[PDB]
Amino acid sequence: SIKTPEDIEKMRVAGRLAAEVLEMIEPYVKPGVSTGELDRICNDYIVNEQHAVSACLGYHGYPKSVCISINEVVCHGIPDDAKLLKDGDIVNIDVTVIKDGFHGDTSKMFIVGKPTIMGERLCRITQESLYLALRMVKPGINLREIGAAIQKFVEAEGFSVVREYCGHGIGRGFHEEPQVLHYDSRETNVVLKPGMTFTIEPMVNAGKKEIRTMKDGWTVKTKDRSLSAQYEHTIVVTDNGCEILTLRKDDTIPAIISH
Ligand SMILES: O=C(O)c1ccc(-c2ccccc2C(F)(F)F)o1
Ligand SMILES: [Mn+2]
Ligand SMILES: [Mn+2]
Ligand code: NA
């Protein structure tokens, strides 16, 4: 669907709120803190300060407000008061808020304590894969091209792209069409049009692409237990490119990408 100027404004608000949850939580992401407390901090902020709601809680039965995944956990890590962050960890906090009917969806990696060169490299490359994709977004381009570019860049780094999950259209619905694969697929045939709003959120494994879902029916880890990183932004396709609706102060890419 093509969002209207009004809907896009609402997406800007929702996207900014999502991004600000990530900016707000940054100081709390330090050695010793539990992912459970991080989640509570994020939820209180979303509800009490942003006057918004987490779109995650309850979705497909998800128990928490945000997803927090550490190191080998690929995605959907469930915040737990007993899971503490430690020196060297790489942690993804994935946020999605609903404000005035629209969704803002974004995530980023945080390196805890003294960074490891491997962790820093995986996160940097993963973000760069998102960035290169964002720089390709504009009317007329096929999502297949973008997915192909992400995969090519990631694999060239000796990393892999997780296939079970993809980006997605977003708006009044958390996950709307189209599906945004982060790898080349013969099934992908979607030509971008102005006003389209979707996410790009590649999950990159340091090791093999295969994953394993834990027995809590949520937590996903790399099959080989290698590190996995993910970054995500919600965007709106413009006439000559795109606008990142979930940009943060620490992002090293412009909010408005012109061509
Ligand atoms: O960025 C996303 O699109 C995202 C993060 C987590 C999920 C998800 C996917 C399937 C079922 C439940 C959830 C959620 F509840 F954790 F949001 O979707
Ligand atoms: Mn997300
Ligand atoms: Mn998403
Ligand atoms: Na991870």
Swiss-Prot record:
Superkingdom, natural source: Bacteria
- Name which cysteines form disulfide bonds: none
InterPro entries on file: Creatinase/aminopeptidase-like, Pept_M24, Pept_M24_MAP, Pept_M24A_MAP1
Q: Name one GO cellular component term.
A: cytosol
Please write the reaction equations for the catalytic activity of this protein.
Release of N-terminal amino acids, preferentially methionine, from peptides and arylamides
> How cofactor binds (record note)?
Binds 2 divalent metal cations per subunit. Has a high-affinity and a low affinity metal-binding site. The true nature of the physiological cofactor is under debate. The enzyme is active with cobalt, zinc, manganese or divalent iron ions. Most likely, methionine aminopeptidases function as mononuclear Fe(2+)-metalloproteases under physiological conditions, and the catalytically relevant metal-binding site has been assigned to the histidine-containing high-affinity site.
Q: Which CDD domains match?
A: MetAP1
Supply the PROSITE patterns for this chain. MAP_1
What molecular functions are annotated in GO for this chain? Answer: ferrous iron binding; initiator methionyl aminopeptidase activity; metalloaminopeptidase activity
Enzyme Commission number? 3.4.11.18
Q: Name one GO biological process term.
A: proteolysis
Q: Where does a divalent metal cation 1 bind?
A: D94, D105, E232
Q: What is the effect of changing D94 to A/E/N?
A: Reduces activity 50- to 580-fold depending on the metal ion bound. Binds only one equivalent of the divalent metal cation with affinities identical to the wild-type enzyme
Look at the named UniProt entry and state the broad enzyme category this protein falls under.
hydrolase
**Binding residue positions for substrate:** H76, T96, H175
The Swiss-Prot or TrEMBL record lists the needed cofactor(s) as:
Co(2+); Zn(2+); Mn(2+); Fe(2+)
Which UniProt key words apply to this protein? Aminopeptidase, Hydrolase, Metal-binding, Protease
| Positions annotated to bind a divalent metal cation 2 | D105, H168, E201, E232
Instruction: Report the family membership.
Output: Belongs to the peptidase M24A family. Methionine aminopeptidase type 1 subfamily.
Tell me the subunit arrangement: Monomer.
Its biological function?
Answer: Removes the N-terminal methionine from nascent proteins. The N-terminal methionine is often cleaved when the second residue in the primary sequence is small and uncharged (Met-Ala-, Cys, Gly, Pro, Ser, Thr, or Val). Requires deformylation of the N(alpha)-formylated initiator methionine before it can be hydrolyzed.
Q: What is this protein called?
A: Methionine aminopeptidase
Organism per entry: Escherichia coli (strain K12)
